[PDB]
Amino acid sequence: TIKPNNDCRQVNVTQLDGNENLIRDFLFQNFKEEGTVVVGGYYPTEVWYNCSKTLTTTAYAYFNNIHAFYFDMEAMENSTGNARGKPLLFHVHGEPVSVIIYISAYGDDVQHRPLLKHGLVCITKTRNVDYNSFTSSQWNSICTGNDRKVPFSVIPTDNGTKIYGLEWNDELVTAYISGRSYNWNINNNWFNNVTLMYSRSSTATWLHSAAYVYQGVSNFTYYKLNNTNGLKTYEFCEDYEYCTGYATN
Numbered sequence: 001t002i003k004p005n006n007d008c009r010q011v012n013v014t015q016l017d018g019n020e021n022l023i024r025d026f027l028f029q030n031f032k033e034e035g036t037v038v039v040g041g042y043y044p045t046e047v048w049y050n051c052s053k054t055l056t057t058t059a060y061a062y063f064n065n066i067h068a069f070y071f072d073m074e075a076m077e078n079s080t081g082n083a084r085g086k087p088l089l090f091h092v093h094g095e096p097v098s099v100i101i102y103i104s105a106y107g108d109d110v111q112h113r114p115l116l117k118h119g120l121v122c123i124t125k126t127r128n129v130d131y132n133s134f135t136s137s138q139w140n141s142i143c144t145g146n147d148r149k150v151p152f153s154v155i156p157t158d159n160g161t162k163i164y165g166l167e168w169n170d171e172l173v174t175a176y177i178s179g180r181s182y183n184w185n186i187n188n189n190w191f192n193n194v195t196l197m198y199s200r201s202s203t204a205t206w207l208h209s210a211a212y213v214y215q216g217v218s219n220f221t222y223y224k225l226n227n228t229n230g231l232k233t234y235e236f237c238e239d240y241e242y243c244t245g246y247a248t249n
């Protein structure tokens, strides 16, 4: 879904440290009973992207025509206490309202940042956003003015074993964090693309590293979920005309 670039590579997300059950626990969020069902939606696939760059130059990645965006992180150091995070910024476009999601770095050292709340949501109406000023200034002056600022705490205790994500339609926005989903009723004209900043220089809130893998989802996917005697398994469905009736009946 990305515009082609030389700094982005493909990885198998489940074949990583701590991601043994990253996607299974996401698919089994709603089907908590025993038996077999079929679930359909903009669910993540096996192959994700890991964009990185050796040099310390601000880089970008562009995702075109996507209806969902998911990412996963590594385990934060000293997760039981003063956890030190890793940075990541991405912007979901739209009119008249767009959303900037920023995960700052470091721990209980960033000035005027609430303790153990590494995540920031900036709901904005401004058209052109300067990312250098956003990721190079102090936290108190990052998202100010007439924009809406919502700090939030990513979970350091999960050790990066939970998937983070976002999905948007013309009438609802769903945010998946920890093992929960939160809804937002808003009428905005989404452009269905995301601009991701994955590499920059070290600054007041940014730390040069690569600890995230991301994926944009554009297609509808159907999974067969089978829960037998506590053993939970999922499989891809190929027959589209058969799984649309299996998920509805």
Ligand SMILES: *[C@@H]1O[C@H](CO[C@@H]2O[C@@H](C)[C@@H](O)[C@@H](O)[C@@H]2O)[C@@H](O[C@@H]2O[C@H](CO)[C@@H](O)[C@H](O)[C@H]2NC(C)=O)[C@H](O)[C@H]1NC(C)=O
Binding pocket: 078, 080, 081, 082, 083, 108, 115
């Ligand atoms: C790992 O973090 C712990 C806990 O951090 C403390 O509690 C957090 C919730 C937050 O308020 C932090 O700012 C706190 O520091 C650290 O334990 C502290 O260690 C210092 C060492 O000088 C000690 O003075 C404090 O009393 C300790 N606090 C507690 C609550 O026990 C610990 O040092 C960190 N480990 C490493 C290796 O950095």
Ligand SMILES: *[C@@H]1O[C@H](CO)[C@@H](O[C@@H]2O[C@H](CO)[C@@H](O)[C@H](O)[C@H]2NC(C)=O)[C@H](O)[C@H]1NC(C)=O
Binding pocket: 062, 064, 093, 095, 191, 192, 193, 194, 195
């Ligand atoms: C995301 O998609 C939007 C779709 O609106 C793109 O913005 C439009 O780009 C076209 C290019 O021909 C312009 O004609 C429109 O005026 C733009 N609309 C705006 C700016 O509201 C946007 O460029 C895309 N962003 C990407 C690919 O990063």
Ligand SMILES: *[C@@H]1O[C@H](CO)[C@@H](O[C@@H]2O[C@H](CO)[C@@H](O)[C@H](O)[C@H]2NC(C)=O)[C@H](O)[C@H]1NC(C)=O
Binding pocket: 050, 051, 052, 210, 211, 212, 213
């Ligand atoms: C994405 O791929 C990059 C490749 O650059 C990985 O970077 C490696 O990170 C480790 C741990 O810090 C370093 O020791 C290696 O030297 C890096 N590899 C290089 C520079 O080629 C990065 O870990 C990957 N991101 C993940 C798996 O989340």
Ligand SMILES: *[C@@H]1O[C@H](CO)[C@@H](O[C@@H]2O[C@H](CO)[C@@H](O)[C@H](O)[C@H]2NC(C)=O)[C@H](O)[C@H]1NC(C)=O
Binding pocket: 036, 226, 227, 228, 231
């Ligand atoms: C869900 O998984 C279970 C295994 O836990 C499958 O159970 C099999 O059922 C067949 C048909 O009765 C038996 O012959 C096999 O011995 C069972 N397998 C095991 C390992 O016990 C069950 O079929 C699966 N459901 C679907 C729809 O594939």
Ligand SMILES: *[C@@H]1O[C@H](CO)[C@@H](O)[C@H](O)[C@H]1NC(C)=O
Binding pocket: 010, 011, 012, 047
């Ligand atoms: C994922 O694993 C499969 C099976 O081994 C392999 O063919 C594929 O290349 C892997 N994808 C990667 C390494 O991006």
Ligand SMILES: *[C@@H]1O[C@H](CO)[C@@H](O)[C@H](O)[C@H]1NC(C)=O
Binding pocket: 079, 080, 157, 158, 159, 161
């Ligand atoms: C995360 O790891 C820590 C030790 O590093 C452990 O105490 C904690 O239970 C782990 N959390 C999960 C969800 O596995």
Ligand SMILES: *[C@@H]1O[C@H](CO)[C@@H](O)[C@H](O)[C@H]1NC(C)=O
Binding pocket: 218, 219
């Ligand atoms: C997504 O669906 C399109 C048709 O809309 C198809 O051509 C394409 O192969 C699909 N991509 C993936 C990754 O499944």
